[PDB]
Every structure is written in structure tokens, then in C-alpha cells.
Design a protein around this ligand. Structure first.
Ligand SMILES: *[C@@H]1O[C@H](CO)[C@@H](O)[C@H](O)[C@H]1NC(C)=O
Ligand SMILES: [Cu+2]
Length: 235
């Protein structure tokens, strides 16, 4: 159970984004239904009144939290991968529009899942803004908690992969549009019960054998990292 507080740009806090530039749901409950419109931008998908200005080559940092800012971030049990997608705002996230900018699942060296490193980073993970057409965008940050993903939600609705999904309204101002955004995948639709990484047993299968759900990260991406860029406690 986790939510996005706001974003940083180039290590500068853009301020509390909840229901402002983040299309925030009312609480930190997971989405589990792979076919639900809730897979796009969670359960209260609507235009919020601000969009964060960035330029191509900027570092955009999502900051997650559990109950209060810079707390335990997400329960340690919620081992799983982290992805970031982008689509143009005109889509409202509908159709084949979502392009993957970032993927992190399991790090064999440190023996840590993306989620484990997200807690250590005080909820912060980043992408570098790509050289797409200037205009308005949705950045969709997605945590998949796998602690009940040995079951499929479609078969047993009290278990399944847990999706923590947050859409940020981002406006790209300065960009040469030298890496125009290629075709996207749909959410809902890209993840199905047979998709690699949706049904997995983290208790019996080695984490080194985990494969995250496609699509692969776009070659145009510059992303990006799970790492603290700013200290929330200084504000
Ligand atoms: C999952 O979402 C689909 C599409 O909205 C819906 O028809 C179905 O009833 C949902 N399943 C549950 C258990 O709510
Ligand atoms: Cu939870």
C-alpha cells in the first residue's frame, strides 16, 4: 500500500502534488483487476488542475509514501518490480499509447528487488525526460507487489499481483522532438494472466529467474534510477 506525494525536477521538490498534478486515488489500496479501466491511472482518473513543467534531459523523480511523507514508504513484504510509462495527455491513457521509459525488477549483485531499493531511497525513483514532441503528457509510475502473485486475481479475487499506479501530469516545454514517441501498449490490456511476471511465486522461485512484464524499455528512453535525490525532512 503506497501513493505518490509529488515529484522533483533536477533535484528540486515541485511541492505536494496530491490531486494537484498527480491524479491521486483516495487511498493507497492496490489495483488487481488487469481488465479494469483502473489499470490506466488508478480509481480516480480525471484531469487535475496543474501540470509540472520540464525540459528534455531533466530528471523527473517520483516520491512515494505509505501513510505520511518519508515514512516506511511501502511494506517490506511487497517485493516486486517498478516501471515508468509515458503517453500524450490527449489520449487520457486510452488506446495503444503507453511507452516504457524505465524497468527495474531484481538486482542480482545487491540481491534486492526494485521495491526494496525504493524503501532505501525514501520513496524516490527517477526517469530522464526524453526528446519527444513538446506538449502535455501523463507519466504512469507502476509498482507491482508480488507477495500474493502465486494466484491470479481473475481466478481468486482475494489474491493476485498488486498494482500501485500513479499518473503525473507533466508538460514538456523545451525539446527538439528528435526521438518522437513510438507506438504504445494499452492499460488495461498489455498485462494478461499469461504475461511473464504477473503470476510468480517469490517464496519458491529464485528472484534471478523473475522476468518483468513486457513491453521492453523504449530505445529512446534515458531513465533513470531508484535513488534518493532530495531530502524531504529539510522542508
Ligand atoms: C474486472 O474488470 C472488468 C472490466 O471492468 C469487470 O467487468 C469485471 O467485473 C471486474 N472484476 C471484478 C471481480 O470486479
Ligand atoms: Cu499493500
Amino acid at each position: 500500500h503506497t501513493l505518490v506525494w509529488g515529484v522533483w525536477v533536477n533535484g528540486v521538490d515541485q511541492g505536494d502534488g496530491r490531486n494537484i498534478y498527480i491524479r491521486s486515488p483516495p487511498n493507497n489500496n492496490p489495483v488487481k483487476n488487469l481488465t479494469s479501466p483502473d489499470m490506466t491511472c488508478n480509481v480516480d482518473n480525471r484531469v487535475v488542475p496543474k501540470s509540472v513543467p520540464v525540459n528534455a534531459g531533466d530528471t523527473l523523480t517520483f516520491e512515494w509514501y505509505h501513510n505520511t511523507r518519508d515514512d516506511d514508504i511501502i511494506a517490506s513484504s511487497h517485493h516486486g518490480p517498478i516501471a515508468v510509462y509515458i503517453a500524450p495527455a490527449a489520449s487520457n491513457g486510452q488506446g495503444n499509447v503507453w511507452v516504457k521509459l524505465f524497468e527495474d525488477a531484481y538486482n542480482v549483485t545487491n540481491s534486492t528487488w526494485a521495491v526494496d531499493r525504493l524503501i532505501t531511497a525514501h520513496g524516490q525513483h527517477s526517469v530522464v525526460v526524453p526528446h519527444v514532441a513538446p506538449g502535455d503528457y501523463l507519466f504512469r509510475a507502476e509498482i507491482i507487489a508480488l507477495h500474493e502473485a502465486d494466484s491470479l486475481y481473475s481466478q481468486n479475487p482475494i489474491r493476485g499481483a498488486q498494482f500501485y499506479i500513479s499518473c503525473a501530469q507533466i508538460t514538456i516545454n523545451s525539446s527538439d522532438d528528435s526521438t518522437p514517441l513510438p507506438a504504445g501498449v494499452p492499460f488495461p490490456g498489455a498485462y494478461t494472466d499469461s504475461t511473464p511476471g504477473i503470476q510468480f511465486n517469490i517464496y519458491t522461485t529464485p528472484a534471478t529467474s523473475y522476468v518483468a512484464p513486457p513491453p521492453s524499455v523504449w530505445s529512446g528512453a534515458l531513465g533513470g534510477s531508484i535513488a534518493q535525490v532530495g531530502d524531504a525532512s529539510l522542508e
